[PDB]
């Protein structure tokens, strides 16, 4: 067939100059994000719940009101769990769904399920409420530029549901949302009409944000097939440092350090990885100290790190998308 | 509905004082244990074998002679192999088998089958006679305190048979004992009469000992859902050291180094991990130089290190149980 | 020369409970430090200048108003430099100067001489105004607990002058105020009336703060006769973390990391060290990125890290003094 | 004083764009250097000796035949030694009489004295004949651009004599050319007529190249007053790398690694360093394997590493000089 | 002179085959040493004390009683201190006083001086009573092959006195004996009637034992002129291990790791090192945790580690000596 599915293998960023980067840095607001994007989401929001719907509405609302012609879809489905068939809902938000190639940013909007205990609630600030807010805050901060899209390539965001186990992490009880959509897409021809290419051939790259939020992350370079793009976040991190544009930051506490990792982490990316989509797994190693504790709350998030990652990521994208 | 299967995430140790610690370090005798508990286990003991029945037997005698109300079982069972059908007997000792919740220590009591070489015999002193002796010594040394068990929690031991492969490593040629027991436990209501919860629900934490006894062990932190418990070993090791109760010991050769391990090792924890039991896998990395050679013998054991880990394990276990 | 001068070698801390620590963390304000004790010193203030007298002046005032009975002295003295003789002044603030033994906290309060460039002035935010405010905030915060000094031990703060070189780093041109004070103290009987014992005998341990206030600092353990005191800084850091009373703080970026250093930094400890005083040199390695640049301003300080090191240091100090 | 002595503190470089960096990298033949600039120097050449005068002569000849206004000088002198007084002869080559400020590159052109063995003769290929050759070649390859010198700053090349000891390394028996040349310049006014300031005040940075030519060298960041220039050598090496311009080179095998060093190496920079000159000491740690052995010859030099470092340096210099 | 003193520069060792290595292991007995060699040294033994004389005498009886023709000098001398002039007695034991060249091994027989605290007493087991013994036992263990000295090369031991400061470490107050004996050897011709070569010229390598006998030592490769012999100590530790000739020993806790050092440790080698004698400094880094505490006692020595270092040292000496 046509070879556009190989394009992703040769695609270069449009690196930005200092003045551009000063602009981007000034364009994102961590407090706006914190107030209007993220505090809504710090609720018990596990699949089913009132939380899940409130969270779901909140995401689309906040997307809905932007100037770029974002196409929100829901994709409610049903899957078996160790408590029976429960109902899930993935969020997709697409720009230019005819864009044969998309760069995808994705995270997970469900919250793990826990019995209230001591009258506390798990609300999953880093796991993964913050990554949802960052993707939100990037759609906003970059809206004027993202409008320019009316290379055949645009941007999709995915918010997955049912990432976490219901009882116990196993292949059977985990990634409900992403195993659904991996399949759905591997079987949806793309572009419409085509005869050999799926919605996955048109994932250039999947950037999975998971567990972001805590002080002192270090992100490993998980895959050779996305390493060049990891290097670019290294380069972006550096230059935004060399230019004043990061806060409480030092290069001896870099986020992205050339440290490859041993065994694989399981996460919403796996249903895509093994179908051949190159992945960039922005999850930290070690996990946050508050992982799956009630203490994974607002109080233990380093606003200042998150701001620095907001900027790094926002640049990464404009550079991919050549805006 | 009862949520007692969650009590394990919120479980905290009752940490001990410097009198207590001195007392423990005092009442464990590496030299008795060496003579009374481990020297008997140092024989060819692959499943089948006369060794196996001897060891099985040894193990039960030295438990049967202590005062606390241990209940030993011998799950003997058949299972297929590359050499046809064969028979395995796991050893399960248990205090308070209605103790709804149990902390579990475990190891394997077989020895791998090797032909005889230069009239040398493979006896597995670290793989895994030493862990078996360690476990038996801990029941001895803690006996008077374990009596106290007449939070509904108690202790349980397991000595798995057929951990090693008969011919060659594989899902199908290995972990005969634990694969078997993990299933039978997943299918057993705990507590009697329960309707939705199995005995695995009652396993707090599985501490599994493998490949102990060589010099300069280094134990990684393998799993994030047991990592606060690995922190307690770090912390126990520390205090027992600053208080001068370890032998030939320095912090520049700690045993528990806060280092995270890439992959998964395969071992008797596997069937219980993939079903959602937390594991504290006390296996070192790298394995001991003598691994799976005829040199895994007594002459190459480090008394001092084994004795240090006894103290550490014994204190871990008392703090877990609140004794 | 009695045998009191060796008690330092056996001194041990009075470790605190989790309730104390909580009080210690809660009773230090980094924002009051920021305006009352630190923002005033951020001015050109090399030796001689009018800044030197104003910073000098500030310090004493901020001490003079506290309840403890601080005995300020001033130690003005003349020395040759590359630009000719000049007049320096060390500040010394002593509790219980008859206190035969003292723990000493010290920084330097000059600022390096630089000509102005682009109309910016060098002010030394980390080199070493934060340290001065740290030492000044510590005496405020701990004031009430320090009236109780009426073992014979007390606390002395020292603010050195002329630490930095005038023109070109060298033994002739550097440490003007601590070469002087060593020697002065090295030859001043202590206690009064003494006959064989100098005031350096009575110096238990000298904690030198320097270059503090940038993000992600790493302090080494430089000297073996003080490691045990470093180790207590390690342990405090850990404990304040595990109770939740540090901020944006992760243990994979501790500040005190058991890492030994090879060479020596020259700094104001040197004249006391080669007099056999025990030094705890809280100077980080690598130096900050803004070292000796005009960018060593307020804008580039990490308030979180300094709250943190303040809490730690305050604790360290109450345990040293058994308060 | 005036202000000019401090201009160096604020000097930024004129970074080169890609096209340029290529043009430099084609500019330099390692083969031309190898045969024209280096092979003449592979001779026994300890001070006094005929290779001492032949070396001296050769160097000069190669500068003389360049366009640029190199002003040569011999500085023959005489110092006490363990074999009596003897006569040395530094070589200085300067562009610009008045260039108030100079970047200096420097290297030592003697050879340690060794009696002959198995008919073998020490010729210090890396110690330091390659550094020399390197400096020559950079003269050669940057002539035309160095013409453009008719910010008041230029270049200077020094080739110290008497670096190595005659007998046994010590302050009194080592560093003969450079202890003399730093005292002499520290007592010569610059610029001519000046009432306050030395030619040292004019030395912007002394780049000392020693021990260069072995495979896989790593150079550390010895000094913090030249760390930004170290960082630039790194940025250059990365960038020359990622553009394809280096040979047999990976970033896993970089030369300039952010690895500070503890204490100091004694080399020809010391006389200048204590006098307040900033130093970029391109010496490797560890020293080469052939260090001070007859085996320090041509056969053990890695031609590929030298080409690469030629490139890196010549760039470093064109960018310091805003050429 | 001549070149006879450049011979150290070329000395290759006569390396042993496995069969010999086994004899040497068999040949030394750590229980013999512990009882007959070291336990007498474990007394308060500063310079001038009766212990000092006790200890001085013991050494000599242990060497007098062997058969090789050890030749005991006794440099006694006076020197000023912070407590007055006092008397010091080195011990020197040569084989072939006329043998031009000499491998020299040395340690120090004094104990620091401490008051008596809780009726406890500082005795210096690691520092340096073990290295004294290790050298004693080296000579017992090797006597028969040492006899074979009737390459003009032989062996020398040195038990320095006064190494430790009397009051507070410092060039004026330390290394009393080595400074004496270094200067006295520098100004003694050798071999007799030589006209420009001293005893120090016929120190081929100085092997300095210090701070030995604690668990888990790591020894840096401190000097480049001695590095090739550190690489021998490494190759020896390896081969002895790969033959199961060391106890309780993994290569992941090697004793000699090829890691270079930054700064410099001050010890009895300085006075020879700045006079140009090659030094293999066997002092660990870090120091023992018990350094200059009362716990530097026999209770805290690692018998296995010492026994392993005896073997390594006895092999090193023989391959040097071509025995
Ligand atoms: O959910 C989980 N339960 C576990 C129990 C034992 C070991 C484990 O690694 C896990 C685990 C992994 C996990 C992985 C990625 C995640 N992203 C967000 N939550 C995440 C959790
Ligand atoms: O038995 C085995 N045969 C192998 C061949 C190649 C690679 C391997 O990891 C193995 C192996 C692993 C193994 C793992 C945990 C064990 N615990 C005790 N023995 C253990 C052995
Ligand atoms: O001041 C300095 N000028 C230098 C030039 C070259 C190398 C150096 O280490 C220095 C240096 C060191 C230094 C050390 C401790 C300090 N504390 C505050 N400023 C400090 C500076
Ligand atoms: O020459 C030397 N003799 C030594 C003996 C013991 C330790 C040492 O570091 C040295 C030494 C250092 C050295 C430093 C830079 C050099 N550049 C060229 N040769 C160089 C030698
Ligand atoms: O004695 C000492 N007191 C110190 C105080 C602060 C730092 C130091 O490095 C030292 C020191 C050094 C030292 C070096 C080698 C020794 N061998 C036996 N004792 C030894 C001691
Ligand atoms: Zn999670
Ligand atoms: Zn095994
Ligand atoms: Zn400074
Ligand atoms: Zn050299
Ligand atoms: Zn000592």
From Swiss-Prot, chains A, B, C, D, E:
Task: Please tell me, according to the UniProt entry, what happens when changing residue 266 to L.
Answer: Lowers activity by approximately 35%
Which GO biological process categories is it annotated with?
peptidyl-pyroglutamic acid biosynthetic process, using glutaminyl-peptide cyclotransferase; protein modification process
Q: List the disulfide bonds.
A: 107-132
Impact upon substituting residue 291 to A: Abolishes activity
Q: Where does Zn(2+) bind?
A: 127, 164, 292
Keyword Signal assigned to the entry: answer is yes
* Record's catalysed reaction(s): N-terminal L-glutaminyl-[peptide] = N-terminal 5-oxo-L-prolyl-[peptide] + NH4(+)
Which GO terms of the cellular component aspect does the record hold? extracellular exosome; extracellular region; ficolin-1-rich granule lumen; specific granule lumen; tertiary granule lumen
Q: Where is the active site?
A: 163, 210
**Effect seen on changing residue 114 to A:** Lowers activity by approximately 30%
The source's domain of life comes to Eukaryota
- Where is it located? Secreted
**Keyword Nucleotide-binding (UniProt):** no
Going by the UniProt record, its keywords in alphabetical order are:
Acyltransferase, Disulfide bond, Glycoprotein, Metal-binding, Secreted, Signal, Transferase, Zinc
- Glycosylated residues, chain numbering: 17, 258
The Swiss-Prot or TrEMBL record describes its family as follows:
Belongs to the glutaminyl-peptide cyclotransferase family.
Name listed for the protein in its UniProt record: Glutaminyl-peptide cyclotransferase
> Organism source for this protein?
Homo sapiens
| Lineage of producing organism | Eukaryota, Metazoa, Chordata, Craniata, Vertebrata
**Gene that this polypeptide is encoded by:** QPCT
């Amino acid at each position: 067939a046509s070879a556009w599915p190989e394009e992703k293998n040769y695609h270069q960023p449009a690196i930005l100059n200092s003045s551009a980067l000063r602009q981007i840095a000034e364009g994102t607001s961590i407090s706006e994000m914190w107030q209007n994007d993220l505090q809504p989401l710090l609720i018990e929001r596990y699949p089913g719940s009132p939380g899940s719907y409130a969270a779901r509405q909140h995401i689309m609302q906040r997307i809905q009101r932007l100037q770029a012609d974002w196409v929100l879809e829901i994709d409610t489905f049903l899957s078996q769990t160790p408590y029976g068939y429960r109902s899930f809902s993935n969020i997709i938000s697409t720009l230019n769904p005819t864009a044969k190639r998309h760069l995808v940013l994705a995270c997970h909007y469900d919250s793990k399920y826990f019995s209230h205990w001591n009258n506390r609630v798990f609300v999953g600030a880093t796991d993964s409420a913050v990554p949802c807010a960052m993707m939100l805050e990037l759609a906003r901060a970059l809206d004027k530029k993202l409008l320019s899209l009316k290379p055949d390539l645009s941007l999709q965001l995915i918010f997955f549901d049912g990432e976490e186990a219901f009882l116990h992490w196993s292949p059977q009880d985990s990634l409900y949302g992403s195993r659904h959509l991996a399949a759905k897409m591997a079987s949806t021809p793309h572009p419409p009409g085509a005869r050999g290419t799926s919605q996955l051939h048109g994932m250039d790259l999947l950037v999975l944000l998971d567990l972001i939020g805590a002080p002192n992350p270090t992100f490993p370079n998980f895959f050779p097939n996305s390493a060049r793009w990891f290097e670019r976040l290294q380069a972006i991190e550096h230059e935004l440092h060399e230019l004043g544009l990061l806060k409480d930051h030092s290069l001896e506490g870099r986020y992205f350090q050339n440290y490859s990792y041993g065994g694989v982490i399981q996460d919403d990316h796996i249903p895509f990885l093994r179908r051949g989509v190159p992945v960039l797994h922005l999850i930290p190693s070690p996990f946050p100290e508050v992982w799956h504790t009630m203490d994974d709350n607002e109080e233990n998030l380093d606003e200042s790190t998150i701001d620095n990652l907001n900027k790094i990521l926002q640049v990464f994208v404009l550079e991919y998308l050549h805006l």
